[PDB]
């Protein structure tokens, strides 16, 4: 029930402890420790920026308009969510991460433009 | 198609590359470099805080309820968006920046109170 306690559980279970991990991301002799702290902050901010770009700011679970490609993974939902962990999944699709991120960004750019026209 | 590539293009074209620039804002000897990194972070956060105050959090394009005053600039939409670059535009209205920002803040504060009452 603590930090990473769900790491060995399946994805459908681990998805319920997202706030446990999110809150553990934040908190000459002594300089290298500042470098680590400054860097930890920059890392955090880059992930938040990325969620903002994709239109997922402020939430831990975000649905999008990008369809899933069977070429990335052809497993079905009852297999992925019930008989696999997040560590395993991360390895399975590690080669498509950049493709997926690119698609999410493009989707949001189109979504913002459409909303702007509707508000005219 | 890279960072600032659209700087010489017109405003109506440059506005389609907002994610390119947003992603380039984040990433005794060695101290002056930590100072630069910390300040880059504080600068970033102040702009994000300001978008938050105005009710534009999480988005690159945000509509507001503050009307445009003809006294700030009386150019029409073609003059501003079909030709004119963002560098030129910023110079043209730099003297009204604080006025506009103050109006945006006031508008959001009123919006929040109206929303709160409508939920009670």
């Amino acid at each position, epitope marked *: 029930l603590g930090f990473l306690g769900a790491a060995g559980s399946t994805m459908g279970a681990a998805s319920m402890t997202l706030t446990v991990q999110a809150r553990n991301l934040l908190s000459h002799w002594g300089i290298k420790q500042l470098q680590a702290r400054v860097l930890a902050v920059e890392h955090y901010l880059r992930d938040q920026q990325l969620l903002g770009i994709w239109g997922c700011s402020g939430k831990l679970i975000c649905c999008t308009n990008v369809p899933w490609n069977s070429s990335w993974s052809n497993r079905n939902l009852s297999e992925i969510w019930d008989n696999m962990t997040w560590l395993q999944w991360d390895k399975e699709i590690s080669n498509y991460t950049q493709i997926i991120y690119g698609l999410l960004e493009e989707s949001q750019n189109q979504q913002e433009k459409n909303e702007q026209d509707l508000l005219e | 198609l890279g960072f600032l590539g659209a700087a010489g293009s017109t405003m109506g074209a440059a506005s389609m590359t907002l994610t390119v620039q947003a992603r380039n804002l984040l990433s005794h000897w060695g101290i002056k470099q930590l100072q630069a990194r910390v300040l880059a972070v504080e600068h970033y956060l102040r702009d994000q805080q300001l978008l938050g105050i105005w009710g534009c959090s999480g988005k690159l394009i945000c509509c507001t309820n503050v009307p445009w005053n003809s006294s700030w600039s009386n150019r029409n939409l073609s003059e501003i*968006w079909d030709n004119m670059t963002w560098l030129q535009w910023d110079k043209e209205i730099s003297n009204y920046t604080q006025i506009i920002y103050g109006l945006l803040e006031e508008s959001q504060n009123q919006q929040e109170k109206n929303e709160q009452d409508l939920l009670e």
Partner: antibody, heavy 124, light 109 residues
């Protein structure tokens, strides 16, 4: 000179389908929103559908909302309309027109600047 | 949807007015009124837009105006060549984007 040319269908039976298309020239196709306007042989004009210059947003008169699809191809300067279930009441001239909407950073429209000649669609 | 009269007429050189009456959440709310001229057998041509404006390409003999929920088209130096069905339309919001009246058969005497 701006031209809009319908190259649509003809006589079709009720309950079937018919596709219309319109070719454009003389202007940047991608700079304008477009629409279809219908005219029954004995009637006035009726707005039917509207599409955004980028093709992302479409609107329909409610009477065809579950039956018609409007689309766009900016590489081929082509506007199109796919009609299904073809009611006899849909017999009309279908005109290709430019206008009906603008795109936020542009001057407003809300009127139609150009018209084609009109395709005659007859449903038996 | 919009009401405009049939059979408006007059002799060359006489002015005529073709009215168009709508509703409050229509002509009464938006200044997006336009008029079209349709010669029988031909596609409509734009004559007036944004209530009072005319496109390049048409004469100044055509002028629009409005008050309340009523819009109208004024034709001044009426010509024989103005025989056509004149139509009014207006923007009426996002749920019902456009509405039109029937045509006015303008006859020149």
């Amino acid at each position: 000179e701006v031209q809009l040319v319908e190259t649509g269908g003809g006589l079709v039976q009720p309950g079937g389908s018919l596709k219309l298309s319109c070719r454009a020239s003389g202007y940047t196709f991608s700079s304008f929103a477009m629409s279809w306007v219908r005219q029954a042989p004995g009637k006035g004009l009726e707005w039917v559908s509207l599409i955004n210059d980028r093709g992302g947003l479409t609107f329909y008169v409610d009477s065809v909302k579950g039956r018609f699809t409007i689309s766009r191809d900016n590489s081929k300067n082509t506007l199109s309309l796919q009609m299904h279930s073809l009611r006899d009441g849909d017999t009309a001239v279908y005109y290709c027109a430019t206008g009906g909407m603008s795109s936020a950073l542009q001057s407003s429209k809300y009127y139609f600047d150009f018209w084609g000649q009109g395709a005659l669609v007859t449903v038996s | 949807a919009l009401t405009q009269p049939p059979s408006v007429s007059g002799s060359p050189g006489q002015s005529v007015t073709i009215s168009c009456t709508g509703t409050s959440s229509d002509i009464g709310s938006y200044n997006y009124v336009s008029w079209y001229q349709q010669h029988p057998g031909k596609a409509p041509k734009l004559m007036i837009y944004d209530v009072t404006q005319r496109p390049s390409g048409v004469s100044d003999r055509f002028s629009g105006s409005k008050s309340g929920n009523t819009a109208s088209l004024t034709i001044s130096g009426l010509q024989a060549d103005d025989e056509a069905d004149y139509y009014c339309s207006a923007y009426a919001g996002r749920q019902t984007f456009y509405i039109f009246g029937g045509g006015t058969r303008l006859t020149v005497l």
